[PDB]
Amino acid sequence: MPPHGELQYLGQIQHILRCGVRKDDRTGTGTLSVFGMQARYSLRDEFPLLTTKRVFWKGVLEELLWFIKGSTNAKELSSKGVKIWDANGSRDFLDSLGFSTREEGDLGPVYGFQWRHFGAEYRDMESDYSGQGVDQLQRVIDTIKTNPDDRRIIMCAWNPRDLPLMALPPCHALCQFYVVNSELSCQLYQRSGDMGLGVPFNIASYALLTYMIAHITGLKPGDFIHTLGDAHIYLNHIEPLKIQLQREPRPFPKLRILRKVEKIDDFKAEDFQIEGYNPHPTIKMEMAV
Amino acid sequence: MPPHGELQYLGQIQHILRCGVRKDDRTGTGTLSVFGMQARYSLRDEFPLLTTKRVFWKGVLEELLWFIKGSTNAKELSSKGVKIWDANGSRDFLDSLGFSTREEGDLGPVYGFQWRHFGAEYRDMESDYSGQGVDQLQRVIDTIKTNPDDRRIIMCAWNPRDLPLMALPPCHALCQFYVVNSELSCQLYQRSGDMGLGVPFNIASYALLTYMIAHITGLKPGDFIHTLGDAHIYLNHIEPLKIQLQREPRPFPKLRILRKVEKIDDFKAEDFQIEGYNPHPT
Ligand SMILES: Cc1cc(O)nc2sc(C(=O)c3ccccc3)c(N)c12
Ligand SMILES: O=c1ccn([C@H]2C[C@H](O)[C@@H](COP(=O)(O)O)O2)c(=O)[nH]1
Ligand SMILES: O=c1ccn([C@H]2C[C@H](O)[C@@H](COP(=O)(O)O)O2)c(=O)[nH]1
């Protein structure tokens, strides 16, 4: 049979441990890093949620939905029990950035804002933006419906102009979608990836994204391609990861979408069912904030 | 001529100050109070947002949409800038009720839950309730839309069986809707309300509610009738209240709706514009 998908990631980890290189950095942690990597993850019918370590599926799903609203409010998400972005939205972190007069939780014009209001002038995380800016998401969706062959189907989060205002500039500069034989593929270009903590999370998100849009446009899910710039492992993750390397992947889950959704916006949390997710136990990995 | 219209509220104020009776409460403060009051506010091309003291409209609005979601997450609301329920979603206050085992912000099965899942088994706030319980709010619209002459259009939030779990037992036990001549009217029963902070907020909420539902149903707004149980004034609010009381009421603002909404769930705050709200300070 074909090999297990998860071995894309695991192999990457191992490459970085053997061929990595020690850079220092802000946190004072240090890293082993590699520049330029890529993996392919079939989305049919499996769903590349990793197994050798339990991934935060709850946060993966809720954060995505939090994106599609166009939210840059860390506390709106955090309320759902998903604290992935609170470290960066805390009064503490903001202040150290110069955002002395910004409300606690205000991530600035990051993902939620760029995906639906690109170019708009960003005031604050609660202002009305409707009609303003470019709606990359729907322009994308609509294109896959009426021009599947387009080589231009792109969402871009990287906005140089808005940079100074973001608590943290996008890790996902951009992503691109692709159709052929009515099979929707997606590749993400990710400027910086934390192999230990972040990258598994990220994979599941764009896989999820991919599935959502396949549903809306009547297509079946193909590949998810993961492209990387600065692939690193924080030196305080090496032990934990080495642990996880010994584990043998268990077959991926399948993703069930429980009802026919018409627009991207009226997706809900309880529309998605994950089947057969039998992951190994989690491993704590310090977030290098 | 009689009042008409923000004068009813004030009239109600005056009456409590004149004919009230001092009665202690939970929070030791003590209050002048009257039991049983009722006022009538016309929704016809005006909108009952009191003008003698500013009413926190962002909160009326965001909190209503919060109810309509079906939410009981105090944090979800606070995030949106409105921090009114934040006081009772606190660990300090929560496990004062023995809810140690409960996440912070989880008010329990209060309004938003009863409105849309009455009689379901409440677990916690971030839980799935799809198809569970009785959807009182949708069942209300549906009626109005097919049997306008019905006198059973009740949305009730007082669940005696869930009181043990509520961070705070609802002030609005129930509201009844009523249709005649293509005009939708609403009456609220408020078991307890203080004219100082709460009551004006509550008028706004329900007037709003009526406007939303009238929209969804194709009817013109009628009256909002506000019934009270323990109507009171907090003894420290007496001085300020006496002052406000001698402010000349300015005309009610208008409330517009900037697009045609199909369902009640698709309302979004941006959909509403207030026009000509010119309150006094405070
Ligand atoms: C290492 C790190 C530093 C920082 O300042 N902020 C963040 S956010 C993050 C994540 O993994 C993450 C991924 C998806 C959503 C939220 C956070 C980091 N690893 C991270
Ligand atoms: O969705 C995300 C967000 C952040 N990171 C990581 C990678 C880096 O460890 C750190 C970002 O730091 P800089 O790129 O700004 O250096 O967070 C991810 O992996 N995924
Ligand atoms: O929407 C609300 C919620 C609460 N209250 C008030 C009235 C009382 O002062 C207090 C409630 O206390 P009890 O009814 O539980 O005593 O809060 C209102 O007026 N409106």
Residue numbers in the entry:
A (entry chain A): 25 to 313
B (entry chain D): 25 to 306
What did the published study say regarding this structure?
TS is a pivotal enzyme in production of thymidine monophosphate and a well validated cancer target. Inhibition of TS leads to thymineless death characterized by DNA-damage, chromosomal fragmentation and concomitant induction of apoptosis. Novel classes of TS inhibitors with improved efficacy and resistance profiles could provide important complements to current TS directed drugs, for which there are reports of resistance. Here, we show for the first time that a CETSA-based screen for direct physical target engagement constitutes an attractive high throughput screening (HTS) strategy, which allows for the detection of known and novel TS inhibitors with cellular activity.
We investigated one of these, CBK115334 or 3-amino-2-benzoyl-4-methylthieno(2,3-b)pyridin-6-ol, which was chemically distinct from known TS inhibitors. Confirmatory data were obtained using CETSA on K562 cell lysates, which demonstrated a 3.7 °C shift at 200 μM. When applied to isolated recombinant human TS, 1 showed a 2.6 °C shift at 25 μM and a 5.2 °C shift at 100 μM and confirmed binding in the low μM range using surface plasmon resonance. We tested whether binding affected enzymatic activity of TS in vitro and observed 60% inhibition at 10 μM concentration and near complete inhibition at 100 μM. A crystal structure of TS with 1 revealed that the compound binds the active site of TS occupying the folate-binding pocket. The binding involves π–π stacking interactions with the substrate dUMP and polar interactions with residues lining the catalytic cavity (Asn112 and Arg50 in particular). This constitutes a novel mode of binding as compared with other anti-folates occupying this space. Amongst the new hits was 1, a μM inhibitor of the purified enzyme with sufficient cell penetration to result in intracellular target engagement and anti-proliferative effects in the high μM range. The binding mode of 1 to TS is partly new and it thus provides a potential starting point for further chemistry optimization.
